[PDB]
């Protein structure tokens, strides 16, 4: 996260750090005690193997994410229509081997319902352990920042992303830059508050540079994917 601030304990209790061989690789968002929403570009081969992945919840610092303090991942499911070249349908699910214990530090975020009626420049938050500067290293501390939705019409203009933003993507950030997601934030939450509830509306998907002007962050449009998400959870339960 570029241009944000450190997060307090419990500020973003759905945020998890997803590790490959005990090293942070991607962020994710808790939606049930066992299901985590993340990005499909985090789990392309050979990272489609759940054996590699552990999730860390309720822990703000990478150095406190010890081998054995994490939840082993049992299943990794990428969106069936994920296209890596275009980044289209960039969403995935991870199922944990055992349920999380919800408390003050670990809580789920709500899946968005049809008819949220979000504002064109809805106020949102991003969080993650990504770099705080372009070309920077993974952040030791969980950060978070305020970003605004950017209408897909404006984001697809010739001087921004030039018709690369599909209906499965949403833009957020600032056309003037300075505040953005960055390398290491992939898969993490883009959330918004409405009716006094925090909703998961995006997962950090791609970008060009970090916090550069006319290159805002692009996120998977979670609203489009909820039918697929419910189908996955329903099929798992019985």
């Amino acid at each position, epitope marked *: 996260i570029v241009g944000g601030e450190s997060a307090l304990p419990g500020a973003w209790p759905w945020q998890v750090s997803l590790h*490959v061989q005990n*090293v942070h690789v991607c962020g994710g968002s808790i939606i049930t005690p066992e299901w985590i929403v993340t990005a499909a570009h985090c789990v392309e081969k*050979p990272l489609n193997n759940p054996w*590699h992945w552990t999730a860390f919840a309720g822990i703000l610092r990478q150095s406190f994410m010890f081998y054995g303090a994490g939840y082993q991942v049992e299943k990794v499911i990428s969106h069936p229509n994920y296209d890596s070249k275009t980044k289209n349908n960039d969403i995935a699910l991870m199922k944990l081997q055992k349920p999380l214990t919800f408390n003050d530090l670990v809580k789920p975020v709500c899946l968005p319902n049809p008819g949220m009626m979000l504002q064109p420049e809805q106020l949102c938050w991003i969080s993650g352990w990504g770099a705080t500067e372009e070309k920077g290293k993974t952040s030791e501390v969980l950060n978070a920042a305020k970003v605004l939705l950017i209408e897909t019409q404006r984001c697809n203009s010739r001087y921004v992303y030039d018709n690369l933003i599909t209906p499965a993507m949403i833009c957020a950030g600032f056309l003037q830059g300075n505040v953005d997601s960055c390398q290491g*934030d992939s898969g993490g939450p883009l959330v918004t508050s409405k009716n006094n509830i925090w909703w998961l509306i995006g997962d*950090t998907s791609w970008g060009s540079g*970090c916090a550069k002007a006319y290159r805002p962050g692009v996120y998977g449009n979670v609203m489009v994917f909820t039918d697929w998400i419910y189908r996955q959870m329903r099929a798992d339960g019985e």
Partner: nanobody, 120 residues
Framework: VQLQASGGGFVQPGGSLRLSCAASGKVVEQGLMGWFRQAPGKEREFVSAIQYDTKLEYYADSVKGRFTISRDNSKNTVYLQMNSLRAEDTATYYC????????????????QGTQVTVSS
């Protein structure tokens, strides 16, 4: 962790090469090491990966059976033995960790490698 790939060169079709990946940094961050390659104008392609204990390896379909990935842990060096090379294998070959190869910016280029050319 800092990585330095080497061992590339120019070879004939059917020839062989062996690439090395020297790593410096904490070994606890090298539990999964990978090789990927990129030809001019083409998207980068993942090639192979290996677990630190060598109990698990991975190969892309395009190189399976012809490439072999291995490790020497007394040197923290990852090798890529490339046999039966074809012209379609021409690219720059890089080694990386998952925290490096999983990119929010797909066209970012902070990933230095070794050039491999196959041509008669």
């Amino acid at each position: 962790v800092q990585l330095q790939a080497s061992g590339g060169g120019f070879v004939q079709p059917g020839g062989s090469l062996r690439l090395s990946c020297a790593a410096s940094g904490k070994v606890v961050e090298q539990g999964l090491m990978g090789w990927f390659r990129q030809a001019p104008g083409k998207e980068r392609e993942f090639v192979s990966a290996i677990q630190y204990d060598t109990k698990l390896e991975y190969y892309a379909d395009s190189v399976k059976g012809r490439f072999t990935i291995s490790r020497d842990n007394s040197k923290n060096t990852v090798y890529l033995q490339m046999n039966s090379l074809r012209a379609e294998d021409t690219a720059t070959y890089y080694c990386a960790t998952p925290q490096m190869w999983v990119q929010r910016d797909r066209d970012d280029r902070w990933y230095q490698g070794t050039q491999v050319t196959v041509s008669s």
